Amino acid sequence: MERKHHFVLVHNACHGAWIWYKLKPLLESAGHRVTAVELAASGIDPRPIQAVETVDEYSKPLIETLKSLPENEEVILVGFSFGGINIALAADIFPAKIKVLVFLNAFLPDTTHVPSHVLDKLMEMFGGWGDTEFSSHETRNGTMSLLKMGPKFMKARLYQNCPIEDYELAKMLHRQGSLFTEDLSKKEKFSEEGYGSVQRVYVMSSEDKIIPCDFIRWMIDNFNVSKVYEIDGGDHMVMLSKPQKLFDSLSAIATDYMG
């Protein structure tokens, strides 16, 4: 039988490992191994976002996960939404541990501009945040901008193609988070030798109301990927609205990178 892979799955800001609860057993049934990483101050991590002052601190559970893998293991590393930035930071540290980066409705940064660049671009044109609550927290690293999604904004812009159960679950579990745009705007640029050396593919939802298709085409065009896979009918939260189709995309990526 064909060889299986280890998928490492990285959630979006304000969410947690829990988002992967449908996708994980589909991947595992097909014989793959799955690690759903919980980022700092995410999901059931008992540590408020206010204690996680930088994007490196936020990402630390992923970096520790890659550090821990046995020698020469390579993973399919999937970053969702803000998880794109996480996986890019991880790839600049452990590029030989990554078979392919999977940017899933994700921020795809480049090696040319400041790491916040594609975030800053989206925020300029974002549209409505609805009932989302914005606040600040002062730190020895500067001021952190925090966000807590509002329920209307979740329903209209993230979860509009999800079953009602999933939306309810999300209301029970979403947390105050941050997109670390200040921290990102002054980090060093991602390197060509680390991040830039790693194979990458982009998986996009057709109905993502957060990360629209034109913005995606722009990021890709700014920083090329080897292949693009589309999920027809996916909302932003495509692991909840179309997990089977997400599984199909990841399965096509595992075949395409089985060498």
Added chain:
Amino acid sequence: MERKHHFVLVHNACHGAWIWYKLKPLLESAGHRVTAVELAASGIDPRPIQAVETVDEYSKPLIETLKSLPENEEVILVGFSFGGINIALAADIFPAKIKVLVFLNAFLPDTTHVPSHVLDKLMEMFGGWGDTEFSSHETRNGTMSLLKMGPKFMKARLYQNCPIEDYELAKMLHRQGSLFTEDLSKKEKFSEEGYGSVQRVYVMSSEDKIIPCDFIRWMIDNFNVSKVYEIDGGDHMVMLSKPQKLFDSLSAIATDYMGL
């Protein structure tokens, strides 16, 4: 269309409000109101159980929910597993805000023995902890016993009839918790005038492998209820394995306490 109700849902130890994710929209699509409480150091509360040292602190979010209800509003208060102890404590405080207590696969304490009684009986009786991790934490008032379920134990004893997705979900959400056995042993008995005065019913899973159906009978004999409802094929996590049947039982309860 006759009166709908406000259901207040109280989760078990080591879990959180998220367990009710299937039940809540069922109740709500039938016109009822639902509050799924999140107890201290549970679910997404960024506070470790070690910091919550007493059952009264654990239960505070429930107390604050009840306290904030409008004057004369009464709720159907559902307590799942250790949630039974929480709802009894709440009923000892605010009996007049509770139309009926629903003990769902729940510890059902009495008004004769110390509040830990039924918990101590289960701990003496139960042989199936498997890979669960027991540990202690010392407080200034004494030892606090803690527990963190193991995934084999979850699969065999709580979730054995749940969809695989729900078990995966629980693995990414459950937390170290506590049954507060030392603290409950030191508390005053539940009262006949508060808790004892509130109507109570019992809803049981026919396949509960953690609170065995015989142990449930022993509890009910020990401290009777008005009515027992049975969910055929439920595991302990019956809001995940048989949510529609649970919905049916709580709708039947809602009918039997229709508001004259």
